[PDB]
Amino acid sequence: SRRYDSRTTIFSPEGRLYQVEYAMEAIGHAGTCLGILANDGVLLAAERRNIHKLLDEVFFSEKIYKLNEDMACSVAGITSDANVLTNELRLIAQRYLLQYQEPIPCEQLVTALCDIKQAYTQFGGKRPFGVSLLYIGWDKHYGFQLYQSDPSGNYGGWKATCIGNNSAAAVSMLKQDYKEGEMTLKSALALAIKVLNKTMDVSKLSAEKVEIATLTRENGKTVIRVLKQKEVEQLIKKHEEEEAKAEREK
Amino acid sequence: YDRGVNTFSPEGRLFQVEYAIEAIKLGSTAIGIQTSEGVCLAVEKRITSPLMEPSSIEKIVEIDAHIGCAMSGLIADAKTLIDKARVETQNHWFTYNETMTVESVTQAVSNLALQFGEEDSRPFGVALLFGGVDEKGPQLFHMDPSGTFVQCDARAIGSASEGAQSSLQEVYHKSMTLKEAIKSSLIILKQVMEEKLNATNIELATVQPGQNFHMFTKEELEEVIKDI
Amino acid sequence: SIMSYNGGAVMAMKGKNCVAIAADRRFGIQAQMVTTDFQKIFPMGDRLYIGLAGLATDVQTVAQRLKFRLNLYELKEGRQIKPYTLMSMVANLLYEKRFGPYYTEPVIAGLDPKTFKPFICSLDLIGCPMVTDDFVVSGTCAEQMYGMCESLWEPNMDPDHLFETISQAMLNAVDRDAVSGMGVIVHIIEKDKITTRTLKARMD
Amino acid sequence: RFSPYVFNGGTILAIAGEDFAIVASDTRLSEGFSIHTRDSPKCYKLTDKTVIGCSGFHGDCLTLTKIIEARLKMYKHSNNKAMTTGAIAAMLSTILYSRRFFPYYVYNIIGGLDEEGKGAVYSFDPVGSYQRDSFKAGGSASAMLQPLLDNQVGFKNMQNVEHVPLSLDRAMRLVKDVFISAAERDVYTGDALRICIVTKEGIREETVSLRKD
Amino acid sequence: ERGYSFSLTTFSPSGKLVQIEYALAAVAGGAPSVGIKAANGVVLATEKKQKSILYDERSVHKVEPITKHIGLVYSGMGPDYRVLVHRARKLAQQYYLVYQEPIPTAQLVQRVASVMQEYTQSGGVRPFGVSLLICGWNEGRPYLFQSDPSGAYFAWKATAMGKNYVNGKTFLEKRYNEDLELEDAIHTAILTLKESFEGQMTEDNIEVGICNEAGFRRLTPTEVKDYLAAIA
Amino acid sequence: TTIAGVVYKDGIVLGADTRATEGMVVADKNCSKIHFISPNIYCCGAGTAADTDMTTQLISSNLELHSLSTGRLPRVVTANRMLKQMLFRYQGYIGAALVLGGVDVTGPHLYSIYPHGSTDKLPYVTMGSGSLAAMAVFEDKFRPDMEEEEAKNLVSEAIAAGIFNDLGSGSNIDLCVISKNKLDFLRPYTVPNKKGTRLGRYRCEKGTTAVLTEKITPLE
Amino acid sequence: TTTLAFKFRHGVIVAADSRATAGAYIASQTVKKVIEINPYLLGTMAGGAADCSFWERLLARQCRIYELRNKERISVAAASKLLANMVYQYKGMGLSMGTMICGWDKRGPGLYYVDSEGNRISGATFSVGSGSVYAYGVMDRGYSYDLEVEQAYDLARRAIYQATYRDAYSGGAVNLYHVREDGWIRVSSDNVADLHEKYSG
Amino acid sequence: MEYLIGIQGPDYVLVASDRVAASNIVQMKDDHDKMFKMSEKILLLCVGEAGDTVQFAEYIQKNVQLYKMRNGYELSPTAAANFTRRNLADCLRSRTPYHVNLLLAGYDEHEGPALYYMDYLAALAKAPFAAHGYGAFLTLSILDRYYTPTISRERAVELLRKCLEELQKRFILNLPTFSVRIIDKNGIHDLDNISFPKQ
Amino acid sequence: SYDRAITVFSPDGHLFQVEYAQEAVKKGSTAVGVRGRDIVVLGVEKKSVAKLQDERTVRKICALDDNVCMAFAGLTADARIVINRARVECQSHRLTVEDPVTVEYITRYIASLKQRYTQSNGRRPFGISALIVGFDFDGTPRLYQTDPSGTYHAWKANAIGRGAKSVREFLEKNYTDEAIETDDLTIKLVIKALLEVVQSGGKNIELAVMRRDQSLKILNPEEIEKYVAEIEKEKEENE
């Protein structure tokens, strides 16, 4: 009765957990996300999976979910398998509010989820989490905090992050346009727009096929802002229009 | 053909346990000797690098007051058995008010030796050398990983085990004294040690009714080294 | 009784299109003065408050536990909670322990998330629901609280006479019993905007 | 309601000699105004070298005596030897502390041959405390027994008191004399007296009877 | 019992779940099913046809509403359909105890897909081949939802399920435009029922439920012959 | 707090008041003790309001899932067995006084609910502290197989009689009528007890109230 | 039924009386409150006698086991620390332990006083018993930290004798032991009546 | 049973503690420290049932030290006072309850001075002064009628003298030793041990 | 729960997926350390940072106490569990026996816990190892090691990770008893070690030092260029 399980937990002849590779392929398939530098604000961008125009889309944000009032997270992976972690981490951040009656610094919260993400790995031959998600928000100490989750258990957090094989071409663009403050939220809007223009193969970079979200720090609001499609339309149109002015070097 | 890990052998016996019995052969070499004056013992620390600190590696431990023990092969699992059996020696002093007898260490360890099972977890590859002196005088005891206990006047474990006992069968006799047991054993020890003899290569473990504990002390072993 | 230790009276007086709530500023032990700073009314959600009168542990327990459930409710779906579901949520937690019940007198004064309709309810420690459009009060003095509402309060009242009536209400009533005093904090909310006023009592 | 603590009677007397030990207990089982059985010895031999006394509730003493002897075979099949007297006293103290929440009401005295053959007398209490004493007298007749034992055996309350060890039969006839005067009041002490003589070779038992009227 | 509960369904070299791919294959080989969210309410049609004349529609139903205001349809096997329906009825009380109010449409999809996605990572079997279509009316605007074995759910006005779900949907894309009414939704429901017909236009070969803002209404085949006899 | 009713020929008529208070102090004149069960069954609460409401929500819970799964009108004894089983497990820890009645296809059914769970079938039952005068008016004036209109007059006069007698009975009158083809919950009915107009005008005016801090919090 | 413990220029003093009975009835004059735990340590007895004995067996258990862990004698502070909490977990069940922990610490002289109520304090002087009013009172009038070893025996024997004079709960023999750096030194066991001929004449 | 001063300065935080552990009327141990130092920005004060006191010292200190080195920074006095309310909630309803008196004190890098109020009933309070002891009825005149919230520590020590004078009037107890810790923007500092002669 | 055999005993003398999981430590980044009577030091390389973002949170050395420094190799997840587990141990040894944690007590916990973590079924061994660097109480130094089987051993100097035999062969200059007579010589010893170990350099080098009771300090990328300046200039001074 020992031959039925595939030994996903047990180590492999390659010297490492073998299922983690296929886990990184699960998030590394169809998942498209990124991050933008944080100077007095931050924004988020993703790809809308729905190609059907008959859909209602009455749920507001599609791939981005709000864990806390002042802090949310981007997610990439299987929908419901991620939705389990949305309400789970939401309850972990809620039981922290149930403790101190005060928001949660992302540091110990991400490491807590990493200790939860290793549960399926370290016992029972369970299937590891096929979802790797980002982190955004603000704290009293470090200000805007942008982190990253890894299937191996590490928090790979950077102020500029990459998710997906198609977004791996943006890392060269991230360091080519790289600056620090310097960068305005508007500059990061055109930065991430040119990221999708280089990576996403959609002709003309259709605005309704990709998800965009922002965040601001206000006293004491600190609103996580879901944006209408009107400003994104004119944003990408004004972006490729600025690119039409960037081809004048010839 | 891996079946249940608990499966017997057609010869036969437990598969996984017998495989660990062969795993004892790569351990350190240790030789105890039973003598009316006291039970001595020694081991080779097997220096893996000149950076090694001498007091950090010890293959002999002290269970009860007059009861010692040794380790073989894998360490940490045996080190857990050491202090866990010490709890049973203190519980022995609870009701009985006196020191646990050296023969009862068999019932305190070898009974719980392998409890492993899939439900309610894996065997051990370490054989223990039980030294001590009970009310009947000096006693040298040895147990295997499977729990089988046997009383031996001299027992060797690890690499030199078969070779040391085969050579020591001639030099041992009922009239062997303490000092003679120490200096006649290090002749085998200097034969079974690869590195040149020094204070950091080997350590001595002794138990006597009138001199203790002791165990043994350093810088005296060097006085025995010049007596080689 | 334990209700005679901390005491306190939460007076929620609904107006015409708006709902108001008031409580005493003093937080102390019996007649020995401690401090007036602790407010027995806590904001919960958007455009909704709750009054609490009883053991300060259970008062803050409802404050933290309602914040627990309400945050889970608002973070799941962004819809604002309706006051009827809120009352059933309060009566649920108070009924969770039948033989272990805490000591509290929850008074919820809130608005309608969809419209301008106000809301008032006052429940016991076992969560006995009462839904009316008139007023809800929970406190020590039985004759004084409801007596001032019978002698003054009317169904249709403007915020001007609403605060003046509840003023003399918290004066000719709360000042009768010494367990509550040392100032009164008033919270009046409406769809238009939120207003907060305070009062003063003797400092002896 | 039902009271689990009730006194069924019994008395313990144990005198530790030089190379011997003298243990005595009354065979009268008396609860209230009724005499149940006229022979009920409270002194049983755990081993051949040890005899323990019993007092207080009846079934608790029989249960405790059987539990102690039940652990003797465990130690016998373990170390291939019986338990020492001091080990039985300490193990009994640990058994009495395991019940410290709701313990028995019992008083025992352990006696017999020790390592050197001397007699043993231990003062026991339901909470499991004890020490080594020369002489102890249990039961409700201990009122005038202890002062007289402090006189002859304890060598106190005497003017210019010389100290000499006591012989075997002297303490015997002393036990026979003291229980006649000790039965003038206490109703639990009387009828037949179970005597236990502990010697280096073995342990002997005898009986002395009193009027049943 | 054993109680292994291990996760044995694992990631493919491409990253997907081959077992869930077999699950969507059971849905793709499922019975034709369709529903339409338009204006006031939602209409459910699908198809039920017995293996012979020995069976009737008057007793066993393929469409059992979850609540009085909430109906449900699906594709795949019935035994596992009534299993998740049984859990849906039980879970409806876990909601109603705290709220003491009826339940929103998506509120079922959140907890049902969570238990369904939990049943993936959980041992034993998986969501199998039952893809449920949840509909209802709340807050003045009704809803039509459908999830998959993996738990991914989407919202739309109308869709086709089971066999020929791509062909019937491409026909509904041109027919459905702007908004439609309940009568028009039933009319094009006859059109998508005539796609795989078989048993369209006949009252005993189909069952028609309808959601409305006044609450879900389940009509007997008698009303199915009323509107469509005379079909279109 | 008084609940009573009588089963007439073709159906069941029940009644309750709205008065729930403590002592002689007037607190809450308006309270609904008639709670929903199902189309064929209603329930009348008494004793502890919150505990009996959570009990009737669990009974309405069991009858909601079972009737929806069966698709048929359940019998009153189905909920009565779980009612008498749950309250019997506590042996009267939670005080429960209820009126369990309804008209099914099998006809009308009535069962008296006690904290121990003992249930007996009668044409009429009276629960609460006002059950003395109500039972007296019933037992004296009741005749079997009355019509619906005469039952309404009997329930109206019986509940209005227990108002003055009982200390905690009064304020509004509630009517509960259960039948096979009709379900009537009529609230309110008649308010015999009232409180007169104020003796004088204490109405407050500005200038006599000192305000320390007035905070303004604009919304939207 | 009264003891005293105090530390001075050299080591700590452990004193006790041998008379402990139930009521005014004379029963056992051999009662020994001072109990040996380790050769370098000494215990006391207060409240329940068996509780003091058993919890000292557990105290010696954890000390010896730890002595076999790191091969080092644990500090007396960290020794009875957990002992205070482990006995405190039974509070309300009838267990009362007022014992004092005596011995030597590697940092210097020390004395520890543990209560079942949860009081654990390290200080110079501590005494438990019925004659504590005479023990504390007549000693503290003449007490000094600069006293010698022989003077410590004289003041301890005097304070114990004053506790055995008027107070009827004290008597029998005087148990007086001394603690030193290398280890506690057993001093003497003397009868109260014999020491009465000393002080009085 | 005994009162500890609650003086709250704008820059500083000042308290006092009586060091007498003696029982009944006898004079035994006067040096027992009633002040528990936790971190640089947070102090601890616990008095009550014996075993309950030291246990709250072990649990709260090591949990604050846990959060200290986990996140690298120190908790604020607000999060520390509300964290102890959870332990006071477990204190209230438990199979083995606890009994305490004193409160928490500390400094914050933003809110500055913070002095809370704790009780075995878990009720939270934040006040410029505290209430304890049997001599509080003369503090409604000396302490309460005359107090300056903006005064420095110099007049605060003199106000502590005026309290210590009338603290012993009809009381036959001793209480000779009073220990004082002072908190400033730089953390906890120590002040001299107060000792009053007899006559 | 979950019943299955982690690894079974093979006649070759060791288990399979445990002793072969030592390759997970062998494939990790290079990590070393040096104890000293004055200041204790360590080092790590192969940070693989993007250099455009904040890498401060990926730091490979944490502290249970100011006197205790944790140096590990291998994957991060099992390292973080070793962190939090040792935090429960150092805090439990903070509550009980108030004085700080001795190295033998924390090494016994970390090693034997991992051993009993390899014992019970349904528990996969950590794919990581670690070595302790710090100062024992009363001024004594400390260094030890950890094994996937949970065996701890104290060396004179710490060389592990990728190229353990390469750096240990480079320790031929470290065998000198004069090292280190001063803290500047200790950092110069780590400078020569970090320059040799392994791929380096100028960016991915990450280390820190602690001297006696003074808490550990992480120098900015300024003095690191100064130690790299005099170390690179020492080759010109040796001509």
Short mmCIF file of C-alpha atoms in Angstrom, two decimals, chain I residues 5-202:
data_model
loop_
_atom_site.label_atom_id
_atom_site.label_comp_id
_atom_site.label_asym_id
_atom_site.label_seq_id
_atom_site.Cartn_x
_atom_site.Cartn_y
_atom_site.Cartn_z
CA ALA I 5 8.57 5.60 5.14
CA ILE I 6 10.78 8.68 4.76
CA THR I 7 13.96 6.68 4.14
CA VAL I 8 15.00 3.09 4.83
CA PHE I 9 18.37 1.70 5.89
CA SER I 10 20.44 0.40 2.93
CA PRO I 11 23.33 -2.06 3.47
CA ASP I 12 25.71 0.60 2.07
CA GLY I 13 25.79 1.97 5.64
CA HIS I 14 23.67 5.12 5.31
CA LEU I 15 20.20 6.20 4.24
CA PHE I 16 19.45 7.50 0.75
CA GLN I 17 17.45 10.73 0.63
CA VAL I 18 19.05 12.01 3.87
CA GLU I 19 22.77 11.59 3.22
CA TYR I 20 22.13 12.50 -0.42
CA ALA I 21 20.29 15.62 0.77
CA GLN I 22 23.73 16.77 1.91
CA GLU I 23 24.12 17.74 -1.75
CA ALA I 24 21.43 20.36 -1.16
CA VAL I 25 23.91 21.87 1.30
CA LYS I 26 26.82 21.14 -1.05
CA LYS I 27 25.14 23.04 -3.91
CA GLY I 28 24.49 26.07 -1.70
CA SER I 29 26.43 29.31 -1.53
CA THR I 30 29.86 29.51 0.08
CA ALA I 31 29.81 30.27 3.82
CA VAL I 32 32.72 30.39 6.27
CA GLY I 33 33.56 31.70 9.72
CA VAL I 34 36.43 32.30 12.12
CA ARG I 35 36.28 32.37 15.91
CA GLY I 36 38.58 34.66 17.85
CA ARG I 37 39.48 35.64 21.38
CA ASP I 38 38.80 39.33 20.60
CA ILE I 39 36.32 39.50 17.70
CA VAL I 40 34.44 36.69 15.94
CA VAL I 41 33.80 36.97 12.20
CA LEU I 42 32.08 35.11 9.37
CA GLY I 43 31.20 35.56 5.71
CA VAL I 44 28.90 34.59 2.87
CA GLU I 45 28.89 35.12 -0.89
CA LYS I 46 26.78 34.39 -3.99
CA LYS I 47 23.99 36.73 -2.92
CA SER I 48 22.63 36.74 -6.50
CA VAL I 49 20.96 40.09 -5.81
CA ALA I 50 19.58 42.26 -8.60
CA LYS I 51 21.49 45.25 -7.13
CA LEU I 52 18.60 47.48 -8.27
CA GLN I 53 16.38 46.62 -5.28
CA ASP I 54 16.54 46.16 -1.50
CA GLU I 55 18.35 42.94 -0.56
CA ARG I 56 18.60 43.68 3.18
CA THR I 57 15.86 41.16 4.04
CA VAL I 58 17.58 38.16 2.40
CA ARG I 59 20.36 38.40 5.00
CA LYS I 60 21.79 34.97 5.80
CA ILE I 61 22.76 35.76 9.42
CA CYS I 62 20.21 36.40 12.17
CA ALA I 63 20.53 36.68 15.94
CA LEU I 64 18.56 34.84 18.60
CA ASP I 65 20.37 36.97 21.19
CA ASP I 66 22.84 39.79 20.65
CA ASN I 67 25.59 37.34 21.67
CA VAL I 68 24.25 34.50 19.46
CA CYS I 69 24.81 34.55 15.70
CA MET I 70 23.22 32.07 13.28
CA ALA I 71 25.16 31.07 10.15
CA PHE I 72 23.51 28.54 7.84
CA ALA I 73 23.73 27.11 4.34
CA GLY I 74 21.16 25.66 1.97
CA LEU I 75 17.62 26.67 1.13
CA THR I 76 15.90 29.48 3.02
CA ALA I 77 12.65 27.80 4.13
CA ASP I 78 14.19 25.18 6.42
CA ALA I 79 16.59 27.89 7.60
CA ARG I 80 13.68 30.10 8.68
CA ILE I 81 12.19 27.13 10.54
CA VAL I 82 15.56 26.64 12.25
CA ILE I 83 15.41 30.35 13.10
CA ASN I 84 11.93 30.27 14.64
CA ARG I 85 12.49 26.90 16.34
CA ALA I 86 15.73 28.14 17.91
CA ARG I 87 13.87 31.33 18.82
CA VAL I 88 11.41 29.20 20.79
CA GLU I 89 14.42 27.49 22.39
CA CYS I 90 16.38 30.67 23.13
CA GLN I 91 13.22 32.28 24.53
CA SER I 92 12.36 29.21 26.61
CA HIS I 93 15.95 29.31 27.88
CA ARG I 94 15.37 33.03 28.41
CA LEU I 95 12.34 32.30 30.61
CA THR I 96 13.94 29.32 32.35
CA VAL I 97 17.55 29.80 33.50
CA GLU I 98 17.43 33.53 32.76
CA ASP I 99 21.09 33.79 31.69
CA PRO I 100 21.68 33.55 27.91
CA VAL I 101 21.91 30.33 25.92
CA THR I 102 25.10 28.28 25.96
CA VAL I 103 26.33 26.90 22.65
CA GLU I 104 26.12 23.27 23.79
CA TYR I 105 22.49 23.77 24.81
CA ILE I 106 21.41 25.35 21.52
CA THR I 107 23.43 22.92 19.39
CA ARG I 108 21.91 19.98 21.26
CA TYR I 109 18.45 21.39 20.54
CA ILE I 110 18.99 22.27 16.87
CA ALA I 111 20.84 19.04 16.06
CA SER I 112 18.76 16.57 18.07
CA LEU I 113 15.47 18.20 17.04
CA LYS I 114 16.48 17.72 13.40
CA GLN I 115 17.44 14.14 14.27
CA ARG I 116 14.08 13.39 15.90
CA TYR I 117 12.64 15.34 12.96
CA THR I 118 14.23 12.67 10.73
CA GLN I 119 12.97 9.88 13.01
CA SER I 120 9.16 10.07 13.10
CA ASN I 121 7.35 9.19 9.89
CA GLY I 122 5.73 11.90 7.81
CA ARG I 123 8.57 14.36 8.48
CA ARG I 124 11.06 15.16 5.72
CA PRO I 125 14.59 16.11 6.86
CA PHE I 126 15.79 19.66 6.37
CA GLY I 127 17.83 20.16 3.22
CA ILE I 128 20.03 22.63 5.07
CA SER I 129 22.91 22.75 7.54
CA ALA I 130 24.25 25.44 9.86
CA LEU I 131 27.28 26.40 11.92
CA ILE I 132 27.26 28.53 15.07
CA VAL I 133 29.61 31.50 15.48
CA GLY I 134 29.66 33.69 18.58
CA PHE I 135 31.12 34.14 22.05
CA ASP I 136 30.52 31.92 25.06
CA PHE I 137 29.87 33.52 28.44
CA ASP I 138 32.81 34.88 30.47
CA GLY I 139 34.65 35.84 27.28
CA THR I 140 35.18 32.38 25.79
CA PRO I 141 34.63 31.94 22.03
CA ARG I 142 32.49 29.32 20.27
CA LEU I 143 32.06 27.57 16.96
CA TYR I 144 30.27 24.34 16.08
CA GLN I 145 28.62 22.55 13.16
CA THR I 146 25.33 20.86 12.31
CA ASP I 147 24.71 17.74 10.25
CA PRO I 148 21.60 16.44 8.44
CA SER I 149 21.82 13.61 10.99
CA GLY I 150 22.11 16.19 13.78
CA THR I 151 25.72 15.80 14.92
CA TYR I 152 27.58 18.83 16.31
CA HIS I 153 31.37 19.18 16.33
CA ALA I 154 33.65 22.12 17.14
CA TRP I 155 36.49 23.04 14.79
CA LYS I 156 39.26 25.60 15.14
CA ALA I 157 37.92 27.44 12.08
CA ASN I 158 34.76 27.19 9.98
CA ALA I 159 35.02 26.30 6.29
CA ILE I 160 31.90 24.79 4.69
CA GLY I 161 29.59 25.20 1.71
CA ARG I 162 30.67 25.11 -1.92
CA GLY I 163 34.38 24.38 -2.16
CA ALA I 164 34.81 23.29 1.46
CA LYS I 165 38.10 21.57 0.62
CA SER I 166 39.26 24.58 -1.42
CA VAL I 167 38.82 27.09 1.40
CA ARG I 168 40.15 24.61 3.98
CA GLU I 169 43.28 24.28 1.84
CA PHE I 170 43.42 28.09 1.85
CA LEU I 171 43.31 27.98 5.67
CA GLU I 172 47.01 27.00 5.61
CA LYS I 173 47.66 30.68 6.37
CA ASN I 174 44.87 30.64 8.99
CA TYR I 175 46.56 27.82 10.93
CA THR I 176 48.95 30.46 12.29
CA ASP I 177 48.31 31.02 16.00
CA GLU I 178 49.10 34.73 15.58
CA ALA I 179 45.77 35.13 13.75
CA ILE I 180 44.22 37.12 14.92
CA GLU I 181 46.20 39.41 17.22
CA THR I 182 43.91 42.35 16.39
CA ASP I 183 40.48 42.97 14.88
CA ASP I 184 42.10 44.53 11.81
CA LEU I 185 44.04 41.29 11.29
CA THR I 186 40.82 39.30 11.72
CA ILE I 187 39.03 41.31 9.03
CA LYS I 188 42.16 41.04 6.88
CA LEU I 189 41.93 37.28 7.40
CA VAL I 190 38.31 37.32 6.22
CA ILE I 191 39.41 39.64 3.40
CA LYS I 192 41.90 37.05 2.16
CA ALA I 193 39.33 34.30 2.73
CA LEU I 194 36.49 36.12 0.95
CA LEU I 195 38.83 37.03 -1.91
CA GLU I 196 39.74 33.35 -2.30
CA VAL I 197 36.24 32.08 -1.51
CA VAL I 198 35.00 31.76 -4.02
CA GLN I 199 33.73 33.36 -7.21
CA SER I 200 33.25 36.73 -5.46
CA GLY I 201 33.73 39.80 -5.65
CA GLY I 202 33.25 43.44 -4.74
#
